[PDB]
Amino acid sequence: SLALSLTADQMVSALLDAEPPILYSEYDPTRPFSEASMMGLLTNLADRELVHMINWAKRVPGFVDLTLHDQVHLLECAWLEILMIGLVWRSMEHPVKLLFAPNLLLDRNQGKCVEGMVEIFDMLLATSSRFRMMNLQGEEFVCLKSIILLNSGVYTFLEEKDHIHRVLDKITDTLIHLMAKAGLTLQQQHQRLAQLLLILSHIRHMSNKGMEHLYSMKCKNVVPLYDLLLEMLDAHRL
């Protein structure tokens, strides 16, 4: 297989074809929403999305090359981060709104419905606008997400780390490639490459906060018994 062998275009296509669908929120509860009401929704969504992410992860070049224990870990650290970059990417053309699902577009105010939820919302929205402010192309979007999957749990786990780095390098040449073809200069390319990666820093930060927030909702009992999503949350205490 080896992803370090396929060419840039083969990498981007591999990542686009691997993309997961845009699932739907449960229909009917329309609006408005009680803290319980809204939380059951986002977790039910996240829960069904996890199943698609797990299967997406395997389609990412070089991932299935890692040992099971390592694939399990990587997804345990980045699952929320990855869910968030998707939401942010889907919200792109929805200034002031966060498109959790086509049938579930939320604006800042509704974030006030769930305690301590609004704060996160502002961060997500700021990143959404940041991506639009930057005209993030989908080709770049798929790279960034693949990078998160590999770079989040890599220093928490030596030949395994080595692979992850060899791959992350290919995703960076490929990312640079995408910018080169868009006519950007060298300076603008490494300039843009830095801008995109620096955002992965807030995506980590927002994830940490959300992770701590989700955990807080479990202690209140507003979070349904979503086993897959629970295990994921649990990987951050164990």
Binding site: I54, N55, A57, L68, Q71, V72, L75, L228, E231, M232
Partner: peptide, 11 residues
């Protein structure tokens, strides 16, 4: 922790 494990193997 099995759910995540099982799903990663369906191969």
């Amino acid at each position: 922790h099995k759910i995540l494990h099982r799903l990663l193997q369906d191969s």
